[PDB]
Amino acid sequence: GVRTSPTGEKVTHTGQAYDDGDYRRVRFSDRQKEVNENFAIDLIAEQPVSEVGSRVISCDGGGGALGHPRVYINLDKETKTGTCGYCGLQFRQPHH
Amino acid sequence: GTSVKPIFSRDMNEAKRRVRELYRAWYREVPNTVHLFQLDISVKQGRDKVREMFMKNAHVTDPRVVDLLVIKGKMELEETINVWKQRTHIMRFFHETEAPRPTDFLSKFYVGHDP
Amino acid sequence: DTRPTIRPRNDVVHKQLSAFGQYVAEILPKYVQQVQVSCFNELEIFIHPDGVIPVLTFLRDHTNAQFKSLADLTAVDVPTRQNRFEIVYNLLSLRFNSQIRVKTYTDELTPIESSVTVYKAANWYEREIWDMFGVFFANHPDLRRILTGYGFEGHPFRKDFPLSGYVELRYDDEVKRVVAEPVELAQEFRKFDLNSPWEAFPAYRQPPE
Amino acid sequence: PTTKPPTARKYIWTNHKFNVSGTPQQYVPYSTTRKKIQEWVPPSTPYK
Amino acid sequence: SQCLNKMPPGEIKVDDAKVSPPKRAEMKTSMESLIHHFKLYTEGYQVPPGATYTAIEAPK
Amino acid sequence: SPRFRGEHALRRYPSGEERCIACKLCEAVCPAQAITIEAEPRADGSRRTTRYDIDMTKCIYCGFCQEACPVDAIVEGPNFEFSTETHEELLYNKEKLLNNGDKWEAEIAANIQADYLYR
Amino acid sequence: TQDTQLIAVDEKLDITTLTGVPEEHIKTRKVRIFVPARNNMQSGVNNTKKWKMEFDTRERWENPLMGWSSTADPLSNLVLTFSTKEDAVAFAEKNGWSFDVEERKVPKPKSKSYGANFSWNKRTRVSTK
Amino acid sequence: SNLIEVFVDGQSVMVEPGTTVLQACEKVGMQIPRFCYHERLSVAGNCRMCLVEIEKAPKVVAACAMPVMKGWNILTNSEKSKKAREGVMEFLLANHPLDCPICDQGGECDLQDQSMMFGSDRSRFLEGKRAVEDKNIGPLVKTIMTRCIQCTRCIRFASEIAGVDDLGTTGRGNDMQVGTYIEKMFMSELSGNIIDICPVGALTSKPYAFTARPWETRKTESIDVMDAVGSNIVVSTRTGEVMRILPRMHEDINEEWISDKTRFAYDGLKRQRLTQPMIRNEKGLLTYTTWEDALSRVAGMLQSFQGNDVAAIAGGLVDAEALVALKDLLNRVDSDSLCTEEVFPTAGAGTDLRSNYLLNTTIAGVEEADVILLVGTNPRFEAPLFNARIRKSWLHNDLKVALIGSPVDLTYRYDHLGDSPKILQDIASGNHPFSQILKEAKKPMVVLGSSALQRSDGTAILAAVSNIAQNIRLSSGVTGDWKVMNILHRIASQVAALDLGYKPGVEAIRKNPPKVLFLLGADGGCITRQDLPKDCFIIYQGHHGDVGAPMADVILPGAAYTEKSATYVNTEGRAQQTKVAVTPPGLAREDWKIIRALSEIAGMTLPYDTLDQVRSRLEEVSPNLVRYDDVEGANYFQQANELSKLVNQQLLADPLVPPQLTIKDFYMTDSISRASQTMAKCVKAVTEGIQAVEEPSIC
Amino acid sequence: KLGLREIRIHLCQRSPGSQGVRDFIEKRYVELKKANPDLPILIRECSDVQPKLWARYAFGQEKNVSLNNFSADQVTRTLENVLSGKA
């Protein structure tokens, strides 16, 4: 999520933060450094992994045409849960 | 081949001629614009600027080329005596706001990577 | 027609214009160098530069042509071709509801006779072409810049001219007047190399030079 | 909205904001990327 | 009045996907539609060489 | 109308993950070249963009961008009203775009729901 | 051919006097005339059949407000396609640009034989297809 | 004669018998679509897209693996051909995942363009696509195996150009997984070239990882300086940064391959870099400062000391313009102590005769040689492209490779004469069995490496190998133009330094300890502060501060090999120009612009003021380093021979061991490579096991 | 002391004018190196380059003398003159 820089700035999702000297920091004074709190990085981790039982699983992303191009994730490597490259939803086989 | 169609002039000489009445017209033209256009430069400060363009344009030798810019100069003179240009347009000849650019290699080296 | 996407073809118009192509070619073999009709029924009359005035008068005055409307007067600057600029006229025939295109070539220096006499519409088109490209037109009533700013140097539509240009403008307070400065973009124009490395049209394949 | 409530989700704001131009809450643009070229930090040990 | 009364049913773009982008429905399920949509919005359709002058009766 | 074109916004999936996978299609179709994005392999491994500055002073609201990305990532909101007092405020970055996405998400979900069948 | 007082001009064409290129950008800039290389990650060779002239690269500094690629050389994103090399270079002297010419690199003709993949003694027998 | 007359689309072409159909239509410009046939690789016909319509024939033919004969008209644009093109391509796109929005190859995507040219505009597939598990085969190559389609390109490249027989296919049917079966780690000096031979976006550059996309990036052509082969590369840059390095095409130089060292090393340009001039403060810590005082301090005390007390040791990645600038500046104070890191035997011809210190036979020459004699070197990690040519000629022409030195593997069978240098004189006498083989060989060849000459007996081996070359040159088995003697170099800018007149080695500096040392690009760390006397003014130029900057008083920052217009010459004397891609970072300037500016303030102003001027002067010193991309074939091997047997030295007993022995030491060579993180990851990948390296990416 | 810091010849591999110096280095070169081992006689060569001799004396000193169509003994005397003044 959003942490605080040693100067007092708020690090964004990309990790950008104007450092100590960083003359550019003058703009934020008398203003705010716009930062979005809903960090995408940790807003997808807590989503549970589907325990669907098959070998190839499609992922429309929800809503059909509202989602993303239908990709088939291979749920065969029994070490790491397969994730759709478009939305990050983790899918895994139900450990046989 | 070498044979090319000339614009107006038939060799250098009358090509050298046409640049003259352009200078003849330009020289007569300087003092009234300084008055009409309300310029900040002196009457003397206009003749040099009229002058310095001319042998700035001195390496040119082709008769067709010479006649080509004497028309451009005539057109520039044309668009000047009807106050079609403005104070800003004329003043653009005087590179005023643009700070002087260095010339020596060492100064080129100090400022930035450029020839 | 089973095909619902392909544009329909009009062979009758194609034959009709091609016959007129042989017509104009035979009447003026002195200037007409090439005549062709495109697949979409457009006739291009490839003339020599000195034929700008004679050929135009023929299509404007001959009873069987009667092209009495100057549609447009353009040039396409091709840096490749020896004489880069290529002056293009488009004429519309009211009586025979047909359109013709006379195209001629010209370098930077050689002038082209102004078509103001045969087509008084060309007069303002004449000024634009010189202003944008630098093709000087001979014996013109008044050749002058029509589009660029007063005192603007260079010919913009010329290919060698940069997209952004050389001169910017801003207000400078120590002079209390708009002043010109060398161009300095806050963002350079991101040029895109969006050309497929695969041949697109076998029909228009150039000979294996 | 009373008849048809919009579908609610986590990230949707709970407090609408007017255009904050002028007030000290106004948005200021700033580069969101990291540094491209860093520099070789000089050593702390002396010259010798 | 005539255009409203004689409106025909059918699609609104040329069926040729190499010229007009495919609809979003086939975008997200079919290989060829996505490939065409990708190239069309990045490269665009390459038109054949040639020149033409088309004029229409614009209100002016 | 539901298909009105206005202030842009970068929406995100129902889970919360952002839709933009940084395919640069919107930048490649931008007629005014207002889109400027750079991507990077994120810590999770997903493919997101480090920077998504949209210059609201260049683009002309063609709407091609909403037609461009195959994940409905960028889309102009119904908010025709975002006039600012300074030029800098109009130059939007990724952070402002996401904030607009989080603010008008109710409208974009509803408007797109209405018009996703016409397209 | 025209009977229009054909003067035999001999001096090499120089229109730099009229194009309006500022003094910095006409002498200092060096253009390079080359055939573009085939993009190695592709396989088609359509982009390597036209000579192209491009100018040298200049400073690219990041804008203070937001990280940009701001430059101050107008002759940066200006390439020009040319059919043949001599026609391409003829543009360079005519516009008075100090040019540098490469040569048209073309794939040397190879000899491919599917029968070689299975030889009796020659050590070119492919291990797997 | 022999030419067979065949027709394409009616037009008749003249083709050499055995020509394939695909080549025949290429002679007229018709490029048959392909996915399996690579010109540099073998032919397999797995593509099934090159199917073309033969005139008056019932069967569509594979244009790739089909020898065309007379009386055939290749109906390329026939309806039968287009239907076959349509049919197989629909099969190709059936199981392609909907990824290319996120697939990095989107933009090149050999599937996309061919689909946009030869393929339908809609999909009639109504079933579920297959998904394939990803296999990790490198921290530098990504593998989304679910995208790629029945390669035979990855497989042939590994088994023919790299020799590593680890890539393969596993199974049959629709799946038939292509990969390595067991968890293996595909590392080779040319492993990275599988990325640019992949038509599909499965094998993708892991360091790239969606940094940018093709259309937005600008491509500039330059020459790599990481090795001494001098591979032509394309530095794709955008917005003022380098994302990718692509291999150009030059046939005899590098074909279309580059080493992984040359490919995934651009990130070093973004690692530890010098930006501003730095000088020592009162306490002894380098501190940033303006250009004037850094130059003034250098110029001020360069003026004081003169004579042979002002030295300069040029490094590895140096500009010929920089070398000549330093040479002229450091000779107006009369100091002919210009040294360099690499050492070449000065006994005899030394640098006088060009024939000594270059690959005389040229790289392309090894593709027609009969026997070769690699002596005390590991070309795989010294000059990877040169080793590929040996393999290519070994593969096709059946060259008989012989290796005297370390038993290091070279992706082919080599006859290990041994490692003791005593073998060299045995071959020269003729008692050794290999001596007569070189006699019977019609194009025999011997090559030495600068690594071997780096030993204490460099003169001994060079004289011995020169004696060997003449001992078979006296026999007329060699042709009148064959150049038997060859010296393979490792440091890029060492031929230019030797050509310019720079004294090879560093022994000159040790014999006379100078007072001002001009470390210009030097990073080998051979001359530390202990060798030179107290209070030396070690001035370090360069780009990456690795070992020169820590031991210095002035840190004048220079540009890098992608930030200038320098001239680098390869190992065979082919001066190539490297064009500017991205401007130097920070306040650093070009290299020759340092010395020229330094000379002006110091007082001994150099004559040349522009880039064209310094090349003209660079022409004055030597007339070959200006002629670009042409091997100025030298001569005079024989006089350098009797000039060489003067000293006669004496061989030691240490076996010839190249510094590079295992893939591990390959990546860590130069300042650019050491700085880069991706190079460190590859070194980690090969040091410990085959599983502790992976970049999280779901591309 | 300006004595013969280095000597540089630039000949063409095939130009008939360069034939003379090629014969010179073919025969009268090994003796020259043995006579002045310290003095480096650079033979940087090229194509289509007229036969040319460069001499490098002390601080920034260089003199030029063409060897066009020079005979064998003609160029030996030319170098003998150059290295005669070893100062």
Ligand code: SF4
């Ligand atoms: S709305 Fe159109 S012009 Fe504006 S940023 Fe999007 S694509 Fe570009």
Ligand code: SF4
């Ligand atoms: S906003 Fe849309 S078009 Fe732009 S990068 Fe993201 S997905 Fe692609």
Ligand code: SF4
């Ligand atoms: S290979 Fe990659 S870019 Fe090409 S079609 Fe498949 S997913 Fe798209």
Ligand code: SF4
């Ligand atoms: S990565 Fe490329 S070469 Fe390898 S199997 Fe896939 S498509 Fe074939």
Ligand code: FES
């Ligand atoms: S090209 Fe793939 S089969 Fe011949």
Ligand SMILES: [K+]
């Ligand atoms: K690839």
Ligand SMILES: [Zn+2]
């Ligand atoms: Zn998904």
